[PDB]
Each structure stands twice: as C-alpha cells, then as structure tokens.
C-alpha cells in the first residue's frame, strides 16, 4: 500500500510547487484520483487478508477506513476553500499540506501491522490536528481546546507506550499477525487487570467515553470545519480501530474487566444524547451526538460478539460520513449567519431550498431510518447488547427515543419555522457547498446498497 | 398587531375587552344564532348595569368578580377564527412569505425575465435610501424631552418625507403568498 | 379611545405607500419573458419486469414459492392424472 501513500506524499510537493491561483484544483483533483487508487484494496476475493509487505497491511477492518481517509481529504480541501481563502498564499499551502499529512499519517495508522507503528503514527496525528484547530481556530478559546485535545490523548498515550513495550518483552514482537496466531492469554491478576486498562484507556480516550469526552465538545466547537470533519470522521475512529486490533491479546480479562466501561458508555449514551436536546450551539449538539453514537461503539467493541464488531464497523464508517455531513452543513450556516447559535437562522428552507434536503437526509442518517447502513449498525449492536443482558434494551431504548428528538429538532429549529427577519441577508448557496454535501451522501447511498464491504473482520 | 401596546391598561379597556371575550365565549356554548342573539343581549344587560358605578373601588370589584365568573364559565374549545393566533390557519401560509430582501441575490438571468418588475423595485429602493437621513433626523429631532417613551412612531409632518421607519410595514411580504 | 391624530396619519401615509408597493408587485404584460402513451409506461415497464421475473427469479432456487394448490374431493390432478376420491356421503 504505497500508492495510497506515496502518491499522497507527493501531494505535498504539489501544494507547495504549484501556482497560488491553481494550488487548490491540483490538490483536490489529484486526491480524488488518490481515492480511486485506494478503491483497489477493496478487491479481496478471498479470506486471506492482504499483507502488502512487512510493515504495511490491510484487512477487512482497515480497508473500509483507508478509503474513507483518502475520500475526505478531497472533501476537506473543498470545505475549507472559503475560510482560508482570506489567507496570504503561504498560510493556505500550509493548511492544505496539514490536511494532506493527516490522511498520509491516518492511511498508514489504519494500514499498519506493528502496533507501536500504530502508536507513533497514532499520536503523531495530534500534531497536524492541533495546528489545524489552534492556528486557524476562530474563537478565543482554541488555545484551551488545543490543550485539552493534547493532554487527554497524551496522558492516555504514555500508558499504552509502556504496555506495548511490555507485551513485546512478554511475547517478543508487536506484529499484529503473529500476536494473533500466538498464545497470549492474560492471567487475571491484579497487574494484568491494569495492563488491560493501560492498552484500552488510550483508545477509549480519543473514542470519547462518557468519563473523558469533554475534550471532543470543546475541540470541535472552535476547530475549523476541516478539523471538525477530520476529528469526527477519522480521528475518533482511530480509537475504535485500536480497540479492535489490541484486544486480540488481553483475551481473558475483558470478559469481566469491561463492565465498568460498558455501563459508563450505555448510561453515557443516554446523558450525552439528552444534553443534545437543549444545547444552543449547533456544532455543540453534533459533537455530543458524536459522543453518544460513539458510546454505542465502545459498547460493542467490548461485548465482543461477531455482530457487535461489524455493527461497530458499519456504524463507524456510516456515522463518520453522516457526522461530517452534519458538521459541513453547520459550517455553511455558520459562515452566512456568522454565529453558531441554533435559535437564530430559523426558516432557512424558505431561502435555501436544497441545502434543506441535504439537512433532512443527514438527520435521517443521524437517527436510524431503516434502508440506511446507520440503522443496520445500531440494529446489530442493539442485538448483541440485548444478548449480553436483555435489560440493555431499556438504556439503548431511551437513547433511540432521544436520538430521534434531537436529530429532528436540529431540522425543526434550523431548517423550518418562519424566516429570521433580517439577519445579514443570506447569500445563495455556492455549488461547492452543495457538492461537498453531495460528495458525503452519494457514498452513503451507494454503501447502503451493498453493506458487505464495510461489515468488519467478524463477518 | 399594527398599533403599539399601551404601558398599563385602563379600567375601561379591561372591561370592554371582556365584553369581547365573554360574548365570543358565549357563542361556543350557544352555537345556534338565535339562542345566542338571545343569551347575549342578556349579557350586555349585565355589563349595561353597573355601567355608571362611580365608585372605582366597586367597579374594580365587579370587574375582578366578572373575570372569575368568566374563567369558570368559559368554553374549553371556543370559536377562534381560522386565521388568528391560536387558530387553525395561523401562520399557515408563512412558508411562502419570503422577506423580499432575497430578490437581491438573484442571478442576472433570473432577473432578466420579469424585467419591468425590477425597474419598479429599483425605484422603491431609491426612495428608501433617499430619505433615511431626513427620517432618522426626524425620528430624533422629535425625540420628545427624555421621559416616558412609547413605541409609537411619528407621521411625516412635511411634504416629500416618508413616514419614519416605513420600509418594513410597507414592503411586507404579502399575507397569502 | 380613538386613533391619535398623529397615528391616523402614520397609518394614513404608510397605507398609501403599501398600496403603491402592491401595485408595483403587479406583473406587466409579458413580464414572464421565458427566454397511446398509457401503454408507454405500463407496457415498457412490464416487459422489463417479466424479463426479470421469468429469467432470473424463476431460474434461481426458492425465489417464487407458492402455497400448494387446493385439491378438493373429486377434482382431478392434472400433473399426475389421479382423481381425488369422492368423499364419504353426507348423510343429512
């Protein structure tokens, strides 16, 4: 997998060497094709996964993501052509390159055989992200948000560093292939009960768990649209990908060491879903929607039943695409409105007829409408959770009712009701804004036709 | 909706606004017109008497026991008109009342058709900018000595001037689009 | 009460302007300057469907399954040739 990567690196030379006026089209057009080369990995045609070479591999779980990581770079660069079009021609070429490095790094992290290669690349992605959030962040508080995003991930990260070096000494190689075909069975000691927490905690932090998710609402609030898309679509899912590949070892402990997180997540799912119900900042509500719909995932990567896992793989890819779509349209309202407040800007369909159709489809993806991969995902996690304990439906049942309420409230108070009297007149929709959306949903429609590709390792 | 709300309400407007709620809440209980036109001229009688009470205290003691008699003898589902707040068509057609400052972002192609329409629209926009100065100045030169201030706005008071702040009472999206 | 003599002129005048706005809203002649089939969508769709149902579904296994046909006493079975025995006589 060096075509999904080397051609990517070369994007950096192109963003720099290219003309200031033509820099945007060379980069966006080329990474669209970079995504097309990424599609070749989908050609499995056999059970044996694809070990491209010693360090680089792609199995069913990584492949559905590498393609998404390559896909969003085009979109990210199309959603940030407006803001970041007021810059000095060298601030742009820095932002474009920063976005380019994220997927170079993220493509490799999702396509990495050695778990510590994951760690080095895993924690590197913070550098590009923190720059995108802090350097271009509009609000006074991004310095703070950046600190929260760096420390919560970093304090979790050093325990994983110690744990992975620890298993290398215990087993003798951090190669995901071998670690899988070798006998690593923890022994339920008090210490192992700590190892397990060391490995999972760093992944559980960037996958916002109810206890440590305050970093994500603060980060996406002041982050520029491209950073918020990256955090929701690819960055948070780095934590999920890690939990799937790391729990191959630590096989016995999670049977009983998971209860704490599972309950934290399911109760967390309800409270995070509910506070979405009365949050005035739209970007705030989407972020907590992201916490709740990701709290379902940590509760399926821990129950560990075949269906959970691919419920997880289905939902992660699906929610990634949906969340960005929501964060992208939130930005289009923010740029014309100039405020994140949900109460202002009422009645837009009256003035932006189509964006509202995109808003409606994004919300229906947000809630579980049935001919969507989003529902298949939740339906499956719901099933397994029920298997874990029939009572789980109650808590995963209060979340579904709340999820319907906030998803439609975003449509009802942003895209319906009487028009706002006279905010700065709202200029019509650009074709870029609409495509950036179409590019998010057309793939959501196509993937829903053949869900098999994003089903995970389990199935 | 047009005129501005008075600060405090008088005795009269409180009495005379019960005569409306009352009679109108008597046409829900008494639906047939005859029964109504009967049971209602009997209502006026109630208000007709106790009309000349000069004893304010008393008057405000007949009013406060009238509006409690009424609250307990009101209809749960009265007859509220179709297009009035609380009605059945209230704000129905508002999905078609776009705010008119939106025809300014139309593509030169769209505005190409509908040609004379925009020829008259550009006249009115000239009227609006041609008076903002004389208007705001009027609004200010006539700021009565600081004190009570009500939301009532002044008329023109000079030829050529246009009533101050007139761009959104005129140019208001048509009711039924 | 009664309108204040200075509010029956701000409604006097502004109504006069609203009347002109609504006149201006009126479209001039020409204003809008612009610059059997039944079988069609019943038969054409049908051929396709049939093509699909008689050459994919029918062909694939267990794609169009049907409750057994009903066979009563005394009625013949076309495929095998058997004649269902007549039932025991109803005495009453």
């Amino acid at each position: 997998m060096l075509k999904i990567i080397l051609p990517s690196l070369m994007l950096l030379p192109l963003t720099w060497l290219s003309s200031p006026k033509k820099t945007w089209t060379n980069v966006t057009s080329y990474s669209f094709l970079i995504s097309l080369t990424s599609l070749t990995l989908l050609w499995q045609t056999d059970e044996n996964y694809k070990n491209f070479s010693n360090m680089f591999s792609s199995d069913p779980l990584s492949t559905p993501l590498i393609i998404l990581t390559a896909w969003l770079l085009p979109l990210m660069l199309m959603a940030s052509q407006n803001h970041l079009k007021k810059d000095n021609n060298v601030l742009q070429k820095l932002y474009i390159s920063m976005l380019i490095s994220l997927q170079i790094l993220l493509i490799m992290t999702f396509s990495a055989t050695e778990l510590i290669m994951f760690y080095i690349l895993f924690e590197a992605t913070l550098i590009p992200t923190l720059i995108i959030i802090t350097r271009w962040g509009n609000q006074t508080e991004r310095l703070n948000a950046g600190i929260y995003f760096l420390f919560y991930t970093l304090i979790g990260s050093i325990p994983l560093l110690i744990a992975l070096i620890l298993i290398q000494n215990h087993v003798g190689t951090l190669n995901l292939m071998i670690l899988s075909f070798t006998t690593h069975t923890l022994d339920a000691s008090w210490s192992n009960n700590l190892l397990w927490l060391a490995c999972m905690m760093a992944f559980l932090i960037k996958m916002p768990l109810y206890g440590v998710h305050l970093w994500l609402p603060k980060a996406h609030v002041e982050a520029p649209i491209a950073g918020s898309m990256i955090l929701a679509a690819i960055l948070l899912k780095l934590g999920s990908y890690g939990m799937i590949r790391i729990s191959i070892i630590l096989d016995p402990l999670t049977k009983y060491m998971a209860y704490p997180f599972i309950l934290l997540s399911l109760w967390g799912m309800i409270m995070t879903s509910s506070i979405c119900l009365r949050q005035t900042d739209l970007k705030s509500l989407i972020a907590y929607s992201s916490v709740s719909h990701m709290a379902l995932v940590i509760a399926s990567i821990m129950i560990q039943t075949p269906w959970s896992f691919m419920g997880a793989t289905m939902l992660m890819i699906a929610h990634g695409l949906t969340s960005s779509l929501l964060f992208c349209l939130a930005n289009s309202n923010y740029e014309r409105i100039h405020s994140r407040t949900m109460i202002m800007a009422r009645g837009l369909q009256m003035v932006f007829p189509l964006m509202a159709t995109w808003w409606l489809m994004a919300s229906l993806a947000n809630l579980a409408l049935p001919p969507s991969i989003n529902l298949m995902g939740e339906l499956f996690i719901t099933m397994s959770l029920f298997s874990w304990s029939n009572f789980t439906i109650i808590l995963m049942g209060i979340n579904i009712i709340i999820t319907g309420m906030y998803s439609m409230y975003m449509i009802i108070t942003t895209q319906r009701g009487k028009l706002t009297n006279h905010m700065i007149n709202l200029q019509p929709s650009h074709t870029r804004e609409l495509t950036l959306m179409a590019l998010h949903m057309i793939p959501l429609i196509l993937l829903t036709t053949s869900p098999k590709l994003i089903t995970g390792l389990t199935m | 909706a047009f005129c501005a709300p008075p600060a405090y309400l008088t005795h009269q407007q409180k009495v005379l606004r019960l005569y409306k709620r009352a009679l109108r809440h008597l046409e829900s209980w008494c639906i047939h017109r005859d029964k109504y036109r009967y049971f209602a001229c009997l209502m006026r009688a109630r208000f007709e008497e106790h009309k000349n009470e000069k004893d304010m205290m008393r008057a405000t003691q007949l009013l406060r026991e009238a509006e409690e008699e009424f609250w307990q003898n009101q209809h749960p589902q009265p007859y509220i008109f179709p297009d009035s707040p609380g009605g059945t068509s209230f704000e129905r057609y508002e999905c078609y009342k776009v705010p008119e400052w939106c025809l300014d972002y139309w593509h030169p192609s769209e505005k190409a058709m509908y040609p004379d329409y925009f020829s008259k629209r550009e006249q009115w926009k000239k009227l609006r900018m041609e008076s903002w100065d004389r208007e705001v100045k009027q609004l200010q030169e006539e700021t009565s000595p600081d004190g009570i201030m009500t939301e009532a706005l002044p008329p023109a008071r000079r030829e050529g001037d246009l009533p101050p702040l007139w761009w959104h009472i005129v140019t208001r999206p048509r009711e039924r689009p | 009460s009664g309108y204040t003599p200075d509010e029956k002129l701000r409604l006097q005048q502004l109504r006069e302007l609203r009347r002109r706005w609504l006149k201006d809203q009126e479209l001039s002649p020409r204003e809008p300057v612009l610059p059997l089939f039944a079988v069609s969508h019943v038969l054409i769709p049908m051929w396709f469907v049939h093509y699909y149902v008689k050459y994919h579904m029918a062909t694939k296994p267990y794609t169009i399954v049907s409750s057994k046909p009903r066979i009563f006493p005394g009625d013949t079975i076309l495929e095998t040739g058997e004649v269902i025995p007549p039932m025991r006589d109803f005495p009453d």
Binding site: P353 | Y114 | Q25, E26, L27
Partner: peptide
Amino acid sequence: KRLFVVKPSLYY
C-alpha cells in the same frame, strides 16, 4: 392581475 411572487433565488 398576475402578481410577482418573490422567491428565493433558484438558479444556484
């Protein structure tokens, strides 16, 4: 008396 019906710009 056909009347002009204001509408959001619908070309974009």
